Amino acid sequence: SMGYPVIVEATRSPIGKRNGWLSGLHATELLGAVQKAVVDKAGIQSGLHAGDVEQVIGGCVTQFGEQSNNISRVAWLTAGLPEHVGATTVDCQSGSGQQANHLIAGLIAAGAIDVGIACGIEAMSRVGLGANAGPDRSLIRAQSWDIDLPNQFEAAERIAKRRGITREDVDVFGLESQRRAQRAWAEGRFDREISPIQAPVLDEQNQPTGERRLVFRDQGLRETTMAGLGELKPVLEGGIHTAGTSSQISDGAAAVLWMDEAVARAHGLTPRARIVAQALVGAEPYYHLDGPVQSTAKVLEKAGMKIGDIDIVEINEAFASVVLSWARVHEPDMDRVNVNGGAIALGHPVGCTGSRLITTALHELERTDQSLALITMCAGGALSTGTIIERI
Amino acid sequence: HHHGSMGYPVIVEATRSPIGKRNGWLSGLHATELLGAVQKAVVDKAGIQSGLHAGDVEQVIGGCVTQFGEQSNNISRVAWLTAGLPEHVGATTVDCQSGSGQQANHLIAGLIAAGAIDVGIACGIEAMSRVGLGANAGPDRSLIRAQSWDIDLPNQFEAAERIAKRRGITREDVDVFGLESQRRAQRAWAEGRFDREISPIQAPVLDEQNQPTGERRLVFRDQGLRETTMAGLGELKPVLEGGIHTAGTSSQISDGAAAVLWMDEAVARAHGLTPRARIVAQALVGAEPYYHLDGPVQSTAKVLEKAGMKIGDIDIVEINEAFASVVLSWARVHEPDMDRVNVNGGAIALGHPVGCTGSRLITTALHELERTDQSLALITMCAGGALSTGTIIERI
Numbered sequence A: 001s002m003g004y005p006v007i008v009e010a011t012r013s014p015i016g017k018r019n020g021w022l023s024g025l026h027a028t029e030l031l032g033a034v035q036k037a038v039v040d041k042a043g044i045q046s047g048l049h050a051g052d053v054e055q056v057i058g059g060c061v062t063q064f065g066e067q068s069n070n071i072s073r074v075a076w077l078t079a080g081l082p083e084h085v086g087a088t089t090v091d092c093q094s095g096s097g098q099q100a101n102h103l104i105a106g107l108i109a110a111g112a113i114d115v116g117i118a119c120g121i122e123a124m125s126r127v128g129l130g131a132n133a134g135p136d137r138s139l140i141r142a143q144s145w146d147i148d149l150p151n152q153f154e155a156a157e158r159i160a161k162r163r164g165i166t167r168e169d170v171d172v173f174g175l176e177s178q179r180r181a182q183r184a185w186a187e188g189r190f191d192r193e194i195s196p197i198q199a200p201v202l203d204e205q206n207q208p209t210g211e212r213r214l215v216f217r218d219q220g221l222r223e224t225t226m227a228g229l230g231e232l233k234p235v236l237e238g239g240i241h242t243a244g245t246s247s248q249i250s251d252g253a254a255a256v257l258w259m260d261e262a263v264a265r266a267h268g269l270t271p272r273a274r275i276v277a278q279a280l281v282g283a284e285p286y287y288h289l290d291g292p293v294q295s296t297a298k299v300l301e302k303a304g305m306k307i308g309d310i311d312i313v314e315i316n317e318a319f320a321s322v323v324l325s326w327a328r329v330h331e332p333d334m335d336r337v338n339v340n341g342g343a344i345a346l347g348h349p350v351g352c353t354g355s356r357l358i359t360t361a362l363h364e365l366e367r368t369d370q371s372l373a374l375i376t377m378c379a380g381g382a383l384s385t386g387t388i389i390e391r392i
Numbered sequence B: 001h002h003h004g005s006m007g008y009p010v011i012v013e014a015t016r017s018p019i020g021k022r023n024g025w026l027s028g029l030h031a032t033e034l035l036g037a038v039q040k041a042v043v044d045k046a047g048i049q050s051g052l053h054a055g056d057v058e059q060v061i062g063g064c065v066t067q068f069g070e071q072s073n074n075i076s077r078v079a080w081l082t083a084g085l086p087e088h089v090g091a092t093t094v095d096c097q098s099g100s101g102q103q104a105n106h107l108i109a110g111l112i113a114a115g116a117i118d119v120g121i122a123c124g125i126e127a128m129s130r131v132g133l134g135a136n137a138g139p140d141r142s143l144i145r146a147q148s149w150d151i152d153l154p155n156q157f158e159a160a161e162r163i164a165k166r167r168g169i170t171r172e173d174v175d176v177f178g179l180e181s182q183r184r185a186q187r188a189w190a191e192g193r194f195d196r197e198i199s200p201i202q203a204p205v206l207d208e209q210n211q212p213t214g215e216r217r218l219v220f221r222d223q224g225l226r227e228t229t230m231a232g233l234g235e236l237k238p239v240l241e242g243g244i245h246t247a248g249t250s251s252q253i254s255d256g257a258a259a260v261l262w263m264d265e266a267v268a269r270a271h272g273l274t275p276r277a278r279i280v281a282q283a284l285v286g287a288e289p290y291y292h293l294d295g296p297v298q299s300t301a302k303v304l305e306k307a308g309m310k311i312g313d314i315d316i317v318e319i320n321e322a323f324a325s326v327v328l329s330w331a332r333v334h335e336p337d338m339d340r341v342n343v344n345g346g347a348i349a350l351g352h353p354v355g356c357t358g359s360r361l362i363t364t365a366l367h368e369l370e371r372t373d374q375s376l377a378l379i380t381m382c383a384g385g386a387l388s389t390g391t392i393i394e395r396i
């Protein structure tokens, strides 16, 4: 009546740019394709079928329109998967896709389910940030609200000033994210984790042409130089972050298949990883997005580990300053941080990214035959998710 | 080869707001204030017997269906901050439609079982006066589904009628049930059965044009109760042309929140808090889309099977009264003693703030087990997207 949760499979779509390669897919189609993909992948060398999954939990931030009404469920049904499977959609802002994994692991630990999928979706081309708040944003908080909680761009600058991070510092970091992303793609590091996705071809306007083709690669990569980044214009007046040093607006989905260990064996699936420690903590509202400092501290503490014990770190590149702040505090070996690039180069479909990072981290641990990875993300509402996973 | 750092999740406290009618007693409260007040209330209730404080909570998980406007942007977190509670506590909001508030409890118990947290709050909120059903879908609802969608999934009112036809349920059948819901709720209230579980809430009063008067009042009663008779019910006009369900046999549109404080058993004891209940079995299953809301049949079956129990082993059942036919259909299949079903009334009389109800039902069931010195309760709810949540809880 108690479970031992392990990851048995993980996959993700390539990540499309805004109005890009995946923008012709209904949000429910994009998530549905990735849910089905993780099941199909597990099915190749086992007898596992979609009907064996008991619950799906998916992260999604802007739960409006195509992404409202429990997209995790609507996606499952839209993809033609079995109706008896339960589904829930969760929102802790950009932490959502990561928390989705924590939550599935918990249901397995409790003996509630033996097989579950944790996933994440965001189709930002079709449902943009703030679509869920309505036209008068003043209305979404109570009159009494008196917390200095800045928007994401102001946050990035407040964090930069807090650490003495310059335009030079962030441009250097943004260059390196593009370089590592390109290296990963040139070497084929993402081949295992990606499920290529069929998508409608768009004419030069954004109407479908009738064409439907496979999309293989992350669209956000582009040739980048220090000089080129230096010409970029800051999002805010007096700011240091530009499009070249901020996460991209993107479309994508990711899914991770979890099982109780003994049940994995019965299905003939190999346990690949487990959670050593997990957390979702609150951060300092003034800075808003400096929470990775706290979530990292918390999982290290729970695991009885130090930053040096970790082989691979995935810290979401919401903005360059978020990562540089975390680094100044935790003093990691940066050769171990976002080794295949991050959201500055690869994109950040907000509700997807948490599951995407767990997927990317696991595959990098396997590629290099290493053991421990830390995943940490800043999140809206001054929150941060953290996970330490270990290979089995 | 390995074993674990696990928790044993138990409920230590549970409370709910009174449930207001649409544009009613609670309609003047911002949704974040209504939830925040109940979050704070469940923490305060524990603090009486202990040194537990809000900062000791590690995570909050809250259910909410229509996550638009006041209810968007992770209302669980916004509510916590708005009520002045400590910033370091994490929060997540969840959506499995009407199942949300119940699944919130399942998920907190999961995090404790996994050893992720020692202290958590499961909750639910819906301010339907301020954020109505469908506000999250946008102007044209055909857009929220892919062109390929070809599933015969009906709206909730069509579902209630399909379920009636599935079981041969008549207008008389549902009217008898609706009457009994009002009668049981009125008896429960008259006897003060709900006094323990209710946290009174201060609410700005709104006039008839829904504008504030400046007056604030303490709300402590469920607003949905009203004098009901078989003759009165028989006069009501069905919601759908040729249907059997009316306002008198359907759940009410309502405002409310509820919250349950969970801990690892050992941590509960360390704080001098008595463990009050645990989950025997929990589930969230998919239901048949054609009928949509008949899923309590399946979720009940699943938890009974996992628990190794029969319906006859259950002392108290809370099955959400989304529509009379949902409950009567479930009863026709599972054959419960109806004297044990919704003993203090249900959503037809008490109201149904959709995201709140799952937590509300656990709160109500626990308190009734305690009141009658009984052991086992089943909670089961139908949900949009053809889903259903089930829980068997047992007193400790």
Ligand SMILES: CC(C)(COP(=O)(O)OP(=O)(O)OC[C@H]1O[C@@H](n2cnc3c(N)ncnc32)[C@H](O)[C@@H]1OP(=O)(O)O)[C@@H](O)C(=O)NCCC(=O)NCCS
Residues within 6 Å of the ligand: A152, A178, A222, A223, A224, A225, A228, A229, A232, A235, A242, A243, A244, A246, A247, A248, A249, A318, A348, A350
């Ligand atoms: C930063 C942001 C505002 C940029 O939006 P954008 O201006 O539409 O982005 P673009 O792709 O058009 O890039 C702008 C310009 O920079 C250029 N550029 C972008 N990346 C470049 C690179 N690596 N090298 C050289 N030039 C680059 C573009 O070519 C473009 O050039 P232009 O002068 O011809 O317009 C947008 O990405 C954003 O909002 N990101 C964050 C989203 C978010 O908040 N997520 C949540 C996190 S907390």
Ligand SMILES: CC(C)(COP(=O)(O)OP(=O)(O)OC[C@H]1O[C@@H](n2cnc3c(N)ncnc32)[C@H](O)[C@@H]1OP(=O)(O)O)[C@@H](O)C(=O)NCCC(=O)NCCS
Residues within 6 Å of the ligand: B098, B156, B182, B226, B227, B228, B229, B232, B233, B236, B239, B246, B247, B248, B250, B251, B252, B253, B293, B322, B352, B354
């Ligand atoms: C059923 C429903 C449509 C009724 O809405 P409504 O008509 O605005 O509700 P009202 O309170 O105004 O009641 C309607 C009438 O019935 C009467 N009525 C209600 N309960 C009564 C009772 N117990 N005895 C006698 N009359 C009653 C009212 O007085 C009213 O009279 P009137 O219309 O002639 O003025 C509405 O409650 C509803 O949509 N419920 C479901 C919401 C939902 O979908 N939840 C999710 C479920 S899956």
Ligand SMILES: C[C@H](C(=O)O)[C@H]1CC[C@H]2[C@@H]3CCC4=CC(=O)CC[C@]4(C)[C@H]3CC[C@]12C
Residues within 6 Å of the ligand: A061, A092, A093, A094, A095, A129, A130, A133, A137, A140, A150, A151, A152, A318, A350, A378, A379, A380, A381, B073
């Ligand atoms: C998903 C992101 C994350 O968690 O990384 C979070 C972080 C900061 C969040 C914004 C804060 C300001 C704001 C005020 C409104 O009234 C509407 C919603 C927005 C635009 C917010 C949208 C979500 C954001 C981008």
Ligand SMILES: C[C@H](C(=O)O)[C@H]1CC[C@H]2[C@@H]3CCC4=CC(=O)CC[C@]4(C)[C@H]3CC[C@]12C
Residues within 6 Å of the ligand: A069, B065, B096, B097, B098, B099, B133, B134, B137, B141, B142, B144, B154, B155, B156, B322, B354, B382, B383, B384, B385
């Ligand atoms: C919360 C309820 C529950 O879980 O009991 C569910 C049950 C049926 C759901 C409706 C189905 C039809 C529909 C079509 C749309 O285009 C927009 C959304 C609505 C209005 C749905 C809103 C939520 C409802 C009422």
Ligand SMILES: [Cl-]
Residues within 6 Å of the ligand: A050, A051, A052, A082
């Ligand atoms: Cl099946």
Ligand SMILES: [Cl-]
Residues within 6 Å of the ligand: A147, A148, A149, A150
């Ligand atoms: Cl603010």
Ligand SMILES: [Cl-]
Residues within 6 Å of the ligand: A169, A172, A173, A176
């Ligand atoms: Cl750097």
Ligand SMILES: [Cl-]
Residues within 6 Å of the ligand: A212, A213, A214
């Ligand atoms: Cl192709």
Ligand SMILES: [Cl-]
Residues within 6 Å of the ligand: A178, A179, A182, A222, A223, A224, A225
């Ligand atoms: Cl480059």
Ligand SMILES: [Cl-]
Residues within 6 Å of the ligand: B043, B044, B047, B052, B053, B054, B055
């Ligand atoms: Cl306190």
Ligand SMILES: [Cl-]
Residues within 6 Å of the ligand: B171, B233, B234, B235
């Ligand atoms: Cl009649």
